Amino acid sequence: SVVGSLIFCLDCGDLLENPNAVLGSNVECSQCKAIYPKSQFSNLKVVTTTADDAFPSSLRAKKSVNYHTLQLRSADEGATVFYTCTSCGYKFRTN
Amino acid sequence: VRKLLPESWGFLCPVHTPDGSPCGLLNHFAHKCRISTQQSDVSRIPSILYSLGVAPASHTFAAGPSLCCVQIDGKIIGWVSHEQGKIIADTLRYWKVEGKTPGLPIDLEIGYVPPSTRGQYPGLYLFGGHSRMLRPVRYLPLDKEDIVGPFEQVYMNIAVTPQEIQNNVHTH
Amino acid sequence: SSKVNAITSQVVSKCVPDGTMKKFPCNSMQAMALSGAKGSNVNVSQIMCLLGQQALEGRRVPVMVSGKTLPSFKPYETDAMAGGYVKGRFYSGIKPQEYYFHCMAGREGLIDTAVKTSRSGYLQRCLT
Amino acid sequence: ENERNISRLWRAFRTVKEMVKDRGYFITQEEVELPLEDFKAKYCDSMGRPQRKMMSFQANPTEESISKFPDMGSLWVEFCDEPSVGVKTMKTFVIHIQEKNFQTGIFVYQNNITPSAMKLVPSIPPATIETFNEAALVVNITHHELVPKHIRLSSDEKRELLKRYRLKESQLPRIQRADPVALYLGLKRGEVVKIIRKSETSGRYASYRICM
Amino acid sequence: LGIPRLREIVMTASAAIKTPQMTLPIWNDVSDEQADTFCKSISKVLLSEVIDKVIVTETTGARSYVIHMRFFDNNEYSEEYDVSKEELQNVISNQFIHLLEAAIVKEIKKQKRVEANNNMNKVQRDRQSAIISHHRFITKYNFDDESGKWCEFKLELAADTEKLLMVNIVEEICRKSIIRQIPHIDRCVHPEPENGKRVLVTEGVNFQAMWDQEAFI
Amino acid sequence: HYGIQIRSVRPDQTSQTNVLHYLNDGQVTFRFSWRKNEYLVPVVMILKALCHTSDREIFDGIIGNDVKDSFLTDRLELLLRGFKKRYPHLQNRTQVLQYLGDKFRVVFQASPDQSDLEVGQEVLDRIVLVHLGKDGSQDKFRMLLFMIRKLYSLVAGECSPDNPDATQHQEVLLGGFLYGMILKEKIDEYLQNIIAQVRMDINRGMAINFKDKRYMSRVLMRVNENIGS
DNA sequence: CTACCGATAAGCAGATCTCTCGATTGCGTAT
DNA sequence: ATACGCTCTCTGCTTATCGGTAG
RNA sequence: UAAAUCGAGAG
Ligand SMILES: [Zn+2]
């Protein structure tokens, strides 16, 4: 029920309240109003690295330096080749 | 906004445009560009899409550019990977040009946006509605006539003449 | 653009007036281009040697999202012609891709011509 | 780093002497062409920290200046050792100007002059008082390439100018009383500055700007 | 360049010129090796130009934050911008944290509607205590005083506060935090000499600061 | 400056434009226009009004298998908690729909007999993603989830912004379709005119009988039926 | 503690060559 | 047949309000 | 005899 930094009710799925904004040792759902103990929800740890693009600079850039084969149906079946030779114009397919 | 663009190849005439105030704004169609005027029968397409490998969106549990969203006329139909999305896009083109399957109209525009690094949002889109801009190109397999649109065109390679065809990179 | 312009300059240096079939003063095109009656050296170069690189607002031909400069060019094609380098000349005609790029350049020229006249009257009015 | 402050003060003192000499008072080139070590010996104590009380000096009009401008009087140049100017310093400076009867005294401060102190600058006519920041005098503006030669005209030459072109005082081109060159020369509203302007088409030619 | 420039000069008399520039002559004494480095001693350096990345570790239940800042190698930015560890660390201690805390407090006010070594030496503890005392809600601080390639510090907020982005805030502050800058000047260049004279071209206008450098200009 | 604009068309070839704005505060705003002025609504309201949804259903429909993506998780947490903070009473679909119908009753010229729930459903069916039409509430919900994910992908710098000037993203108003839609608007105006006539009859006259053919033919002659002009 | 001097954030105004044709010009009650 | 009420600006100036001085 | 607005053009 715990993903990221938010906790979802296991009965209905409404977003639960922020634990540190409720009286201790009990979390109550907003709609179905089930019983949720504040235990076992110890760490809402979320890490967030920057965009790796928010800091454009000069030193930043220095760490970055006729026949057709077609797949028709699915990845299992082999590729089918369609030839159309310019010598005569005769076109044909091959598997 | 007045610039001539490579996307208008075959739809807007590069030459026919008044000189002066209306330059770039008032332009004309290419002489073989037929504008769609009636909805194509896109009723059977979701069924054949499911057979190809599309996973129906009703019970999929998927989202994001990491998967290929398969949509029709502005309605999500399924979620299949980018590789299989390209496979089914080419399959749909082949079946639509080879006018055997009844569920695929010849005017079905197949806009496939493959994954790219910070490019356009990927996914498979199918259009069959009114007012679309369509032009006839020659599908090189089967050596037949295909109809393409501006959205569908900017990702596939159409040789301007058969003498300039290259292997494995040109399909029209 | 610099490299393709260097190639263009080499072609023009080699192929005129040495490569011309008719020479000045008999060649009236060169006769009226050298004397200043009408035209320039770049005009006869385009007529007789090549059109050269087509410049869109100082850059080359615009690129689509897919990386194609045109439907007939593979994505990110490392070609001078793909970027807008016309090797053809008005004597022997130009290819459809070169035709499209030249149309882009001519349209940009007309747009600039229209927008330049409107951009200068107010300065003279204020000064006067 | 204190050497940088010493050098800046030396440059400011040199430019102040150049300004006084240009204004028409007698300053010999020995004072202007003062070597840095000579300045340190003459104005820096054992610790090397300069004292700005000894830098204050007095100047008198030259013979030519008295011949041309008979109304000129003694000039008193003051430096403020205090890092700021308050009511106490400004009023004391004004009284020091008055008690010695100086016709003009120019004030050089360090950081800023308190607005309560700024009220006493126009307090005492006719002896005007001028305010100059030390950091604004590190480089003499009139030595710049673009600035021309400005020479304040005497009353007789002003009469001759306004008679030759048949002008009112106002029809002349105007130079702002607060622009740097007018503060440099010490222009009081009404008098004209002749400008020897080097032209691209005519070489030297003379313009005239009245200060208003 | 062109008619718009005329529009700036004649029509508007813009004191706020769109692209101000300043030309500086060069004494024949100085050499191009000194010239290339002098233009780097005046050009502005934002704090963001040296940060490789920023990692925000938010653990709520009082809110906690580990605002780790990963820099480029010291040999890299100590050469590209001539910025040493001491100057960068002082800018972070004095300028960056103040702006960050001000922005956080402002946002809350408007919304009311490889492992680093744990052990520290004697002086670092006192510096941490001083930084905690001078700022509002910092409970930890450390700088890589030996290598200058990271900076980790804590940030405690009231447990009642709701979620903040805490990455856009750091992104905005870092681009506006300044290591070194001469006022109204953002960059100095050393273009090729034209018509013989050697000239430095700067993208800002501050005569008073250029008056100091008699040695070079 | 980010956003997701969509132009949907009903079967009769008339268009409604829906614009999803992204606010630096963290909330996304649905924007439309009814007669000649714009209206704005937090998109969580419309998401819950379209069909019976939990709060984790939206989380799963927006955040896919990428549970470990911090950007998307933080933005969606901000959005959901903002909706909870601003509207703490709205808990089920019908209540949200009733609130929406109460908010949009005067502008839509809703009849006095319309329940707030049904007028809210009508406002939904007339505004948000009309190209799915009625009975497509599930499809409208999926489309909105896709559009929100696309907006978040754009603001994260993982997608190029589509160029409206490029012909790749354009269509043609044929003129005949414009003729049809302007004629439809004129017919709608005609119906409104006859209703306004019988309204001015209610407040002034007395010989009024809705079941009388005579009254119908009498009040029909009082309007301007010359649509062709 | 309170009144004067500024110092920005926000709102508001006007504005960005000549010449030739054709076509239209409103409705909504009340009497 | 007929008369009277009506949704992608550049440059400033000008206003409102926020801090600091010193009175 | 007039005026706007729209539209089309010329240099
Ligand atoms: Zn619940």
UniProtKB/Swiss-Prot annotation, chain A:
Zinc finger (C4-type): 9-32
Binding site for Zn(2+) 2: C85, C88
Subcellular location: Nucleus, Nucleolus
SMART domains, sorted: RPOL9, ZnF_C2C2
ZnF endpoints (TFIIS-type): 66-93
Family note: Belongs to the archaeal RpoM/eukaryotic RPA12/RPB9/RPC11 RNA polymerase family.
Known partners and oligomeric status: Component of the RNA polymerase I (Pol I) complex consisting of 14 subunits: RPA135, RPA190, RPC40, RPA14, RPB5, RPO26, RPA43, RPB8, RPA12, RPB10, RPC19, RPC10, RPA49 and RPA34. The complex is composed of a horseshoe-shaped core containing ten subunits (RPA135, RPA190, RPB5, RPO26, RPB8, RPB10, RPC10, RPA12, RPC19 and RPC40) where RPA135 and RPA190 form the DNA-binding cleft. Outside of the core, RPA14 and RPA43 form the stalk that mediates interactions with transcription initiation factors and newly synthesized RNA. Interacts with RPA2/RPA135.
Protein name: DNA-directed RNA polymerase I subunit RPA12
Organism: Saccharomyces cerevisiae (strain ATCC 204508 / S288c)
Gene giving rise to this polypeptide: RPA12
Curated annotation (Swiss-Prot), chain B:
Task performed by this protein: DNA-dependent RNA polymerases catalyze the transcription of DNA into RNA using the four ribonucleoside triphosphates as substrates. Component of RNA polymerase I (Pol I) which synthesizes ribosomal RNA precursors. Besides, RNA polymerase I has intrinsic RNA cleavage activity. RPA190 and RPA135 both contribute to the polymerase catalytic activity and together form the Pol I active center. In addition, subunit RPA12 contributes a catalytic zinc ribbon that is required for RNA cleavage by Pol I.
Misc note: Three distinct zinc-containing RNA polymerases are found in eukaryotic nuclei: polymerase I for the ribosomal RNA precursor, polymerase II for the mRNA precursor, and polymerase III for 5S and tRNA genes. Present with 14100 molecules/cell in log phase SD medium.
Annotated source species: Saccharomyces cerevisiae (strain ATCC 204508 / S288c)
Family as reported in the entry's similarity comment: Belongs to the RNA polymerase beta chain family.
Compartments, record wording: Nucleus, Nucleolus
Residue stretches spanning the membrane: none
Full-protein interval shown: 517 to 688 of 1203
Top-level taxonomic group: Eukaryota
Name of the protein this chain belongs to: DNA-directed RNA polymerase I subunit RPA135
UniProtKB/Swiss-Prot annotation, chain D:
SUPFAM superfamilies in UniProt: Eukaryotic RPB5 N-terminal domain (SSF53036), RPB5-like RNA polymerase subunit (SSF55287)
Quaternary organization: Component of the RNA polymerase I (Pol I), RNA polymerase II (Pol II) and RNA polymerase III (Pol III) complexes. Component of the RNA polymerase I (Pol I) complex consisting of 14 subunits: RPA135, RPA190, RPC40, RPA14, RPB5, RPO26, RPA43, RPB8, RPA12, RPB10, RPC19, RPC10, RPA49 and RPA34. The complex is composed of a horseshoe-shaped core containing ten subunits (RPA135, RPA190, RPB5, RPO26, RPB8, RPB10, RPC10, RPA12, RPC19 and RPC40) where RPA135 and RPA190 form the DNA-binding cleft.
Protein location: Nucleus
A Pfam cross-reference name: RNA_pol_Rpb5_C
CC terms in the record's Gene Ontology section: nucleoplasm; nucleus; RNA polymerase I complex; RNA polymerase II, core complex; RNA polymerase III complex
Principal place of residence: nucleus
NCBIfam families to which the protein is assigned, alphabetical: PRK09570.1
Record-stated family: Belongs to the archaeal Rpo5/eukaryotic RPB5 RNA polymerase subunit family.
One record GO biological process: RNA-templated transcription
GO terms of molecular function: DNA binding; DNA-directed RNA polymerase activity
Highest rank taxon of the organism: Eukaryota
PROSITE patterns: RNA_POL_H_23KD
Cross-referenced Gene3D superfamilies: RNA polymerase, Rpb5, N-terminal domain, RPB5-like RNA polymerase subunit
Cross-referenced PANTHER family: DNA-DIRECTED RNA POLYMERASES I, II, AND III SUBUNIT RPABC1 (PTHR10535:SF0)
Protein name listed in UniProt: DNA-directed RNA polymerases I, II, and III subunit RPABC1
Keywords of the record: DNA-binding, DNA-directed RNA polymerase, Nucleus, Ribosome biogenesis, Transcription
UniProtKB/Swiss-Prot annotation, chain E:
Domain of life: Eukaryota
Annotated compartments: Nucleus, Nucleolus
Signal peptide: none
Spans traversing the lipid bilayer: none
UniProt function note: DNA-dependent RNA polymerases catalyze the transcription of DNA into RNA using the four ribonucleoside triphosphates as substrates. Component of RNA polymerase I (Pol I) which synthesizes ribosomal RNA precursors. Besides, RNA polymerase I has intrinsic RNA cleavage activity. RPA190 and RPA135 both contribute to the polymerase catalytic activity and together form the Pol I active center. In addition, subunit RPA12 contributes a catalytic zinc ribbon that is required for RNA cleavage by Pol I.
Subunit structure, as described in the record: Component of the RNA polymerase I (Pol I) complex consisting of 14 subunits: RPA135, RPA190, RPC40, RPA14, RPB5, RPO26, RPA43, RPB8, RPA12, RPB10, RPC19, RPC10, RPA49 and RPA34. The complex is composed of a horseshoe-shaped core containing ten subunits (RPA135, RPA190, RPB5, RPO26, RPB8, RPB10, RPC10, RPA12, RPC19 and RPC40) where RPA135 and RPA190 form the DNA-binding cleft. Outside of the core, RPA14 and RPA43 form the stalk that mediates interactions with transcription initiation factors and newly synthesized RNA.
Family: Belongs to the RNA polymerase beta' chain family.
Miscellaneous note of the record: Present with 2840 molecules/cell in log phase SD medium.
Protein name (record): DNA-directed RNA polymerase I subunit RPA190
Protein encoded by which gene: RPA190
